[PDB]
Design a protein around this ligand. Structure first.
Ligand code: SF4
Ligand SMILES: [Zn+2]
Lengths: 66, 107, 143, 431
């Protein structure tokens, strides 16, 4: 923790995985894996050792009335 | 306080009588149901047409068609008029699921 | 036999002053459709050979192929009593001729010939494939 | 085809009554498979934005255009991203169009104007385009490859450009005895004349087996299916619609007695507005839901009818392209839609759709044998060829309320013949 919260914030702004501020984080991870762009096997291995926490399993701007 | 402990049943679409069970029509107004389905699908149809004209206008005012919109401009009518149609559509879509589905989906 | 439907048609047409299509004369007398067309042709041939000056008007149906500009279309028309042979000579191939209706006093357009068939359908709604030449098998009331 | 066989016998009906009259049987429909499952939407969550659709469109359409620009301009390839371009160097770019037209209405008849620009756009930035390219034939939303160089004013000079093209197509088995399929569109129940009423009556009377001699009754018994394609209730003004569903229920009852029927929603029909239109609810048809020969589908319809695979719409993509382009011929617009590998490229920018996010479903994944359209103002049909062994029959279905014309498609020779109905009107040739 506090290092796992920057890896996800770095996965969320890389443009080669998609334009993602409307959906979940694991849905975008599996969308890129289907098309197989290059999802890395570390943004998966922190979404498995946690429960349904809203500060891991949510996009950066999931507040913010946009 | 007490206002939160509501729901779990909805009132008749025809004559507004609260009752047990989830079916949309009332037993006295059960006959007239094709007309009551006809009514309100022309409302869902007009909310669908308003969602799409607004959420693609932000893409042309922003410049790009491939990246997210971030513009909370308080002097634009576009902002917060694009926020309420999501909820109107959220509500009007769920009122028509009182009626069954028009077919299967797992075939 | 013959006098039965001959007198029935002679009271339907000339006394009650009605308009008799083949489908009305097959829902009245409970007859097959082709046999009803044959009945109407029998009546018109008898009463047009007897007298030649009756108060009787006919309308027929002509169907068949055509070529307008290269392409082969299929034209189907409900025609009056004056214009039959010209419509028959415009066509290329001929495929169907029978009788459609008879009248007492002449109409102006094809208005009431839909009203009659519609109204006799309106009360007779549990049977339409009853006197039909095609009898499918998978269409029986199930759901 | 049909009217050739309809004269192949003897004529009995200008005769006095007989002992027997012949009857027949409807031909079996021993194979059918609906494969329109990507258009049936079970969950239907809104609250996304329209940027997930363009991104997956580009990501899926990119290798087709790379693989065609290789064999169309030589394997000495120069394909490059829009940011890595050097001034005045020959390269190939793969991107998405955006047409910048004024006179297109904003929130607060054709719409093409003599000045309007094209812009090639990728995920990161844009660039303007001039040179040898058509300014008014192309529409916003087409993905294409292009050849040229970055000039000094920041613009781009285009020499030639290529589209995605036709998809692969497996061959169909041949048939033994010819079966026919009838296509109708746009009855317009609610307004539109009285000659349309007798035309609709004569059409259902021919197909059900009530009209004509043993030739017509032998030939209409071979018609295996009936497809009704959109715009069933033409409406004069919304703000009438309740009394029209009763008559549509009666007509679908009189057709569900003999044939199998497939019914599709249209521009005015009681469904949603976005483009994968969902099927009609059965609670508006009391009478016709007794039989299991009536079926209700939606907008984009695929099927496999006796080996031959069909795909069609009710004519909402073709008229949308007709609004914001310069092409007039509807058969040409249908073939162009086939050429860019997308059923409706102008969506969403001027034709609304659902906000998908996993995969864009309007990209052709295979090639259909038949491909029809909806409510077009006149009949037309054609056969086109692919680069490989790919042949496609293209039909435009007319509109019944004006022309009173339907189409017969043979399933063994694969040809289409028009059928027209016309009762006599107020006609007197002595004036
Ligand atoms: S909310 Fe209004 S100002 Fe902001 S991008 Fe949309 S249209 Fe433009
Ligand atoms: Zn009630």
């Amino acid at each position: 923790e506090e290092a796992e919260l920057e890896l996800l914030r770095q996965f969320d702004l890389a443009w080669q995985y998609g334009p993602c501020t409307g959906i979940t984080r694991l849905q975008r991870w599996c969308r890129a894996k289907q098309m197989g762009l290059e999802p890395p096997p570390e943004v998966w291995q922190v979404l498995k050792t946690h429960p349904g926490d809203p500060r891991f399993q949510c996009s950066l701007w999931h507040l913010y009335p946009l | 306080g007490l206002l939160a402990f509501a729901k779990r049943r909805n009132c008749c679409i025809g004559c507004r009588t609260v009752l047990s069970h989830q079916g949309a029509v009332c037993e006295f107004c059960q006959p007239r149901e094709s007309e009551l389905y006809q009514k309100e699908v022309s409302h869902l149809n007009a909310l669908e047409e308003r969602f799409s004209r607004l959420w693609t206008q932000c893409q042309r005012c922003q410049g790009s068609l491939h990246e997210d919109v971030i513009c909370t401009s308080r002097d634009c009518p576009i902002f917060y008029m694009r926020k309420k149609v999501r909820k109107d559509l959220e509500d009007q879509e769920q009122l028509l699921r009182r009626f069954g589905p028009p077919g299967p989906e797992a075939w | 036999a013959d006098q039965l439907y001959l007198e029935n048609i002679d009271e339907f047409v000339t006394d009650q002053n009605k308009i008799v299509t083949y489908k009305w004369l097959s829902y009245t007398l409970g007859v097959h459709v082709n046999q009803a067309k044959q009945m109407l042709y029998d009546y018109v041939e008898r009463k047009r050979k007897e007298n030649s000056g009756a108060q009787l008007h006919v309308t027929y149906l002509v169907s068949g192929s055509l070529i307008q500009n290269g392409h082969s279309c299929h034209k189907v028309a409900v025609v009056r009593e004056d214009k039959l042979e010209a419509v028959k000579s415009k066509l290329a191939v001929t495929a169907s001729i029978h009788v459609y209706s008879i009248q007492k006093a002449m109409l102006k357009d094809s208005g009431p010939l839909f009203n009659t068939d519609y109204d006799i359908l309106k009360s007779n709604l549990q049977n339409c494939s009853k006197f039909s030449a095609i009898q499918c098998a998978a269409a029986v009331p199930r759901a | 085809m049909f009217s050739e066989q309809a004269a192949q016998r003897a004529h009995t009906l200008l005769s006095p009554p007989s002992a027997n009259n012949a009857t027949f049987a409807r031909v079996p429909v021993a194979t059918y498979t609906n494969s329109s499952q990507p258009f049936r939407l079970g969950e239907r969550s809104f609250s996304r934005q329209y940027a997930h659709i363009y991104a997956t469109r580009l990501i899926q359409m990119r290798p087709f255009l790379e693989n065609r620009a290789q064999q169309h301009w030589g394997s000495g390839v120069g394909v490059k991203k829009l940011c890595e371009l050097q001034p005045e160097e020959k390269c190939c770019v793969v991107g998405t169009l955006f047409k910048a037209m004024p006179l297109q209405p904003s929130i607060l008849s054709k719409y093409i104007h003599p000045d309007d620009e094209l812009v090639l756009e990728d995920e990161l930035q844009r660039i303007k385009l001039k040179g040898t390219i058509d300014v008014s034939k192309l529409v916003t939303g087409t993905v294409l490859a292009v050849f040229g160089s970055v000039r000094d004013d920041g613009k781009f000079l285009v020499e030639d450009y290529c589209f995605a093209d036709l998809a692969p197509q497996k061959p169909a088995p041949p048939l033994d005895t010819d079966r026919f399929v009838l296509l109708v569109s746009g009855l317009g129940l609610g307004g539109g004349g009285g000659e349309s009423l007798l035309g609709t009556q004569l059409l259902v009377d021919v197909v059900t087996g009530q009209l004509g001699d043993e030739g017509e009754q032998c030939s209409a018994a071979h018609v295996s299916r009936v497809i009704l394609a959109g715009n069933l209730l033409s409406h004069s003004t919304q703000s009438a619609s309740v009394e029209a569903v009763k008559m549509l229920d009666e007509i679908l009852l009189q057709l569900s007695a003999s044939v199998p029927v497939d019914v599709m929603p249209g521009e005015f029909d009681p469904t949603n507005y976005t483009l994968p239109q969902q099927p009609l609810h059965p609670c508006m048809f009391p009478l016709a839901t007794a039989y299991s020969t009536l079926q209700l589908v939606t907008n984009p319809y695929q099927a496999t009818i006796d080996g031959v695979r069909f795909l069609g719409t009710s004519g909402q993509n073709v008229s949308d392209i007709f609004r914001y382009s310069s092409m007039e011929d509807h058969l040409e617009i249908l073939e162009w839609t086939l050429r860019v590998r997308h059923i409706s490229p102008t969506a969403p920018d001027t034709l609304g759709c659902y906000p998908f996010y996993k995969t864009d479903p309007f990209i052709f994944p295979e090639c259909p044998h038949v491909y029809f359209c909806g409510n077009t103002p006149s009949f037309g049909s054609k056969i086109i060829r692919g680069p490989e062994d790919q042949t496609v029959l293209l039909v435009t279905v007319p509109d019944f309320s004006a022309t009173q014309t339907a189409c017969l498609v043979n399933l063994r020779s694969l040809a289409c013949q028009p059928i027209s109905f016309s009762g006599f009107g107020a006609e007197d040739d002595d004036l």
